[PDB]
Structure formats: structure tokens, C-alpha cells
Design brief:
- The structure is a monomer.
- By secondary structure, this protein is α+β, with helices and mostly antiparallel strands.
- Strand 4 and strand 5 form a beta hairpin.
- It starts with 9 loop residues before the first helix and ends with a helix.
- 43% of the residues lie in helices and 19% in strands.
- It is globular and about 50 Å long.
- The chain has 2 domains: 10-128, Beta-Lactamase (2-Layer Sandwich); 134-203, Winged helix-like DNA-binding domain superfamily/Winged helix DNA-binding domain (Arc Repressor Mutant, subunit A).
- Helix 6 packs across helix 8.
- The longest helix has 14 residues, at 131-144.
- It has helices at residues 10-16, 40-46, 50-53, 68-80, 131-144, 148-158, 163-170, 174-187, 193-203; strands at residues 22-26, 35-38, 84-91, 97-108, 115-124.
- It is built from 9 helices and 5 strands.
- Bound molecules: flavin mononucleotide, chloride ion (CL) (2 copies) and magnesium ion (MG) (3 copies).
- One chloride ion is lined by residues 172-173, 176.
- One chloride ion is lined by residues 33, 57, 78.
- It is classed as transcription.
- The entry lists the keywords Light-activated transcription factor, DNA binding protein, LOV domain, transcription.
- The assembly is monomeric.
């Protein structure tokens, strides 16, 4: 099955379009928390077009060998509004199995009002199946270059707090939080918020 989805708003596109990583957004108020947008990298990773994905829950990538003890951790993150990174067996449109390092994280619309989920998928090769640990090592090194306030804002954003919540936690304005976020993105060459949440969760700071 599949539901018809409203074209994505600009903030949805801003979350994923410039990520070099397969990135998606879902809307949990729609039937079966379906995908409402995918980037180009997601089509290149999986072979599915945007028309084939949007309106469906992302578990269409699952197949015979997919680990329910790992997908349950995603289910838990979605229910608790917390980020989860697991490495699960998935299947491309042509039936090619691949190990998917998938991040599912809470994210907010550009008014900091309603909750959505972002998804970030990286292929782990059968060749180099410990690639996950190499991405963790890189992430940890990058985050150690951040100033203390930048690290604090990064941690709380990646933990799933909206900017208004980060602002309340640190005694700042939303504007000041958005400024610190932008400087982290510029310093670490991160294209989108999905890319920022991913290095935070890879490192284990969220
Ligand atoms: C934004 C987002 C991205 C997701 N990406 C994937 C993915 O790449 N592969 C996949 O198998 N599951 C993915 N999922 C997980 C499924 O949608 C689902 O949450 C998970 O399998 C647990 O739910 P279930 O027990 O009903 O399957 C994603 C979920 C969301 C919300
Ligand atoms: Cl879901
Ligand atoms: Cl301030
Ligand atoms: Mg596109
Ligand atoms: Mg299941
Ligand atoms: Mg709005």
C-alpha cells in the first residue's frame, strides 16, 4: 500500500537535498509514518525513484534476513523521540542485499512546532564491513575540534531537541542557537542538519 503525500515544504528539502548521504524524511501523522521526501543519494543507493518511495514506510527496504532486534531499536527511538543508529540487512529494488547503517532521528519543522523523522542510510560493503567503526573514529575526531558551546549545542540538537528547547536549556535565544549551529556546519563541512545529527550519533555524543 501507499498514501498520496503533499509536496514537501522548503525546510524538508533543506534537511536532505544537499547531503552526500542517502537521506529521507517521514511524517508520523500520516498512515504508517511514511516517507514524504528522499534525496538523489537515496535513489542512487537503493534504485527506487522518489515516486516509488514517497507515501510508503521505509521498511520496504527490509527482506528475509533483516534483524528484528535492530529494527525494534528504531521502533523504540520513534516512540521515545530519540535518535538510533543500527546496521541492518536491507534490499535494493533489484533484490541486491546490502548492510545499511541507518540513522533515524526526530526533527522539527521550520516553526519548531510539529515532529518529523529524518533518516540517513550508508551502505557498509561486504568487502569492508567495519566501515561503521571508521566513520565513528572520524566523527569523534571532528567533534573534538569544536569549542565547548558548539559541542553543547551539537549534543542537544542531535539528542532530538528543537532550537527553542536548546535555547531554554542553555539560557540563549533561538537566534543565538541557530548561529552556533551554522558555525558547526561551516567548520565541519556539513551540508545539512541530517549530516550534523549523523556525526553526533556515530561518535556516541547522542
Ligand atoms: C525516517 C526513517 C527512515 C528509515 N529508514 C529505514 C531504512 O533505510 N531501512 C529500513 O529497513 N528501515 C528504515 N526505517 C524503519 C522503518 O520505517 C521502521 O521504523 C522500523 O523497521 C521499525 O518499525 P516496524 O517494527 O513496524 O518495522 C526508517 C524509519 C524512518 C522513520
Ligand atoms: Cl515507523
Ligand atoms: Cl543569547
Ligand atoms: Mg530530487
Ligand atoms: Mg517487523
Ligand atoms: Mg509552520
Amino acid at each position: 500500500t501507499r498514501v498520496e503525500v503533499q509536496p514537501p515544504a522548503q525546510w524538508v528539502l533543506d534537511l536532505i537535498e544537499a547531503s552526500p548521504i542517502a537521506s529521507v524524511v517521514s511524517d508520523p501523522r500520516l498512515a504508517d509514518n511514511p516517507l514524504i521526501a528522499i534525496n538523489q543519494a537515496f535513489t542512487d543507493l537503493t534504485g527506487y525513484s522518489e515516486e516509488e518511495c514517497v507515501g510508503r514506510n521505509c521498511r520496504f527496504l527490509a527482506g528475509s534476513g533483516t534483524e528484528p532486534w535492530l529494527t525494534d531499536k528504531i521502533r523504540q527511538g520513534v516512540r521515545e523521540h530519540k535518535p538510533v543508529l543500527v546496521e541492518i540487512l536491507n534490499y535494493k529494488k533489484d533484490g541486491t542485499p546490502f548492510r545499511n547503517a541507518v540513522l533515524v532521528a526526530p526533527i522539527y519543522d521550520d516553526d519548531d512546532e510539529l515532529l518529523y523523522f529524518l533518516g540517513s542510510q550508508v551502505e557498509v560493503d561486504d568487502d569492508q564491513p567495519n566501515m561503521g567503526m571508521a566513520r565513528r573514529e572520524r566523527a569523534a575526531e571532528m567533534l573534538k575540534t569544536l569549542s565547548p558551546r558548539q559541542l553543547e549545542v551539537t549534543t542537544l540538537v542531535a539528542s532530538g531537541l528543537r532550537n527553542k528547547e536548546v535555547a531554554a536549556r542553555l539560557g540563549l535565544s533561538e537566534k543565538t542557537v541557530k548561529m552556533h549551529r551554522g558555525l558547526v556546519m561551516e567548520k565541519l563541512n556539513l551540508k545539512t542538519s541530517a549530516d550534523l545529527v549523523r556525526i553526533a550519533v556515530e561518535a556516541g555524543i547522542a
